[PDB]
């Protein structure tokens with residue numbers, strides 16, 4: 001193997017670097033993994049399928065136009081170039097290599113398609129038809145849309161889209177499950193808290209945040225416990241950005257935001273699936289947890305969980321490491337079937353007032369087929385009223401002592417509508433034993449005399465009862 005000769009490959013610092021500030025993709029390419037045989041689709045504003053750096057890898061079977069209801073996802077050209085974003089993301093995954101044009105994709109021999117679905121009214125049905133496109137042909141989906149990143153919205157998939165996620169992970173990809181890679185949001189300037197976005201907060205999406213070139217949390221990032229890992233993206237004007245294919249058969253050096261991080265993750269996942277095509281949607285999340293790297297990502301909330309892994313709400317388990325992903329994938333043993341242990345916590349409603357703590361010792365379905373000794377995702381499904389939602393901060397502590405922030409204060413969230421069975425999700429207790437005392441903390445972070453009631457707290461544990469590693 002020889003490294004790519006493309007003219008902008010040297011500018012793709014997050015791949016081509018030799019300073020240890022990269023995604024370690026060359027190490028995967030040198031193991032022989034470039035994405036051959038894998039199919040990725042960008043769910044966004046279309047794909048310029050005739051782009052000189054995409055045409056060679058373009059896959060009509062990975063593509064559709066849901067906005068206009070036809071097979072051709074070609075973007076709508078406008079003076080502002082509004083519909084350029086899906087083309088930028090497609091090239092991050094699978095721009096052609098060694099062809100004298102722009103740079104390369106992470107998985108530069110993968111097949112790449114796009115769904116034109118953001119350029120029109122985006123209904124639940126539009127979302128569902130995109131998520132459910134050709135699920136026995138497309139392996140990996142990449143998306144960065146969801147509720148407005150204004151820091152005051154709480155919303156997620158409606159019924160058709162939620163059904164598309166469950167059909168994808170259950171029957172997609174021959175029963176191994178569609179891999180939905182998702183960006184955690186761009187609401188950092190609005191102090192948004194991304195578990196309020198039900199798309200990234202889902203267990204069925206493999207959620208990704210961003211780091212700047214110098215290893216910092218970018219201005220646009222949202223922190224939340226549902227995030228799994230990180231890839232590089234843009235930062236300040238002294239830091240480089242993402243280099244990729246652009247609309248009108250051009251090359252950009254200024255692709256930005258968390259929406260540029262999810263496609264890079266999708267490309268790394270494509271390399272990993274080439275290394276072991278039998279990996280399930282859950283296997284893939286395990287690989288990410290085990291291989292991602294905190295090193296040189298700066299945050300003030302790095303904490304060690306109960307199995308010795310460092311986790312952050314900005315970064316999840318850290319920067320994706322492509323070489324480590326493909327290495328660990330090769331001999332990976334498929335995880336056991338997913339168990340689900342439902343624990344209804346409250347015996348009566350609880351006044352919140354200034355601060356509420358709910359403590360409960362659980363057996364995690366001891367003696368039952370859904371007994372869980374090895375956690376994957378955990379959810380605190382909460383139903384509560386409160387007079388100003390954004391003054392609330394919510395934490396969940398596992399028996400092993402891992403404090404997950406379920407909700408941070410959102411100063412713009414003035415809503416009086418509370419949370420209606422909202423399934424706040426944390427990845428930070430992955431591989432812990434969930435037996436023992438869990439603690440839920442709800443606090444009013446303002447000096448205001450706020451008021452409300454918690455009426456339901458369901459602790460939902462997912463996981464297995466076998467296969468643990470020694471703690472890190």
Ligand SMILES: NC(=[NH2+])N/N=C/c1ccc(/C=N/NC(N)=[NH2+])cc1
Nearest residue numbers: 045082083085144145146147185197
């Ligand atoms: N939770 C969230 N992820 N929210 N995302 C919000 C949002 C808002 C606008 C656009 C426009 N895209 N326009 C294009 N792609 N041409 C995309 C996403």
Ligand SMILES: NC(=[NH2+])N/N=C/c1ccc(/C=N/NC(N)=[NH2+])cc1
Nearest residue numbers: 118119122145146147155156157158
């Ligand atoms: N359940 C939900 N809240 N789904 N939200 C989906 C969603 C939200 C905003 C946009 C904006 N697009 N803006 C543009 N294309 N200029 C697209 C999709």
Ligand SMILES: NC(=[NH2+])N/N=C/c1ccc(/C=N/NC(N)=[NH2+])cc1
Nearest residue numbers: 154155156157158159160161162163
């Ligand atoms: N903004 C929103 N409207 N969000 N709504 C979300 C949401 C999600 C799933 C379902 C499933 N319903 N399944 C049934 N009724 N059998 C219903 C609503």
Ligand SMILES: *[C@@H]1O[C@H](CO)[C@@H](O)[C@H](O)[C@H]1NC(C)=O
Nearest residue numbers: 176277278279280333334335
């Ligand atoms: C895929 O994994 C399943 C579950 O472990 C196993 O039964 C099957 O033989 C595997 N298939 C291949 C081709 O490795």
Ligand SMILES: [Ca+2]
Nearest residue numbers: 065068070072
């Ligand atoms: Ca079309």
Ligand SMILES: [Ca+2]
Nearest residue numbers: 006096101103
């Ligand atoms: Ca190229």
Ligand SMILES: [Ca+2]
Nearest residue numbers: 149185187192
């Ligand atoms: Ca958000």
Ligand SMILES: [Cl-]
Nearest residue numbers: 166340460462
């Ligand atoms: Cl479920």
Ligand code: NA
Nearest residue numbers: 200202205207
């Ligand atoms: Na997710």
Ligand code: NA
Nearest residue numbers: 304305306401
């Ligand atoms: Na700890």
Ligand code: NA
Nearest residue numbers: 399434435436
């Ligand atoms: Na315990």
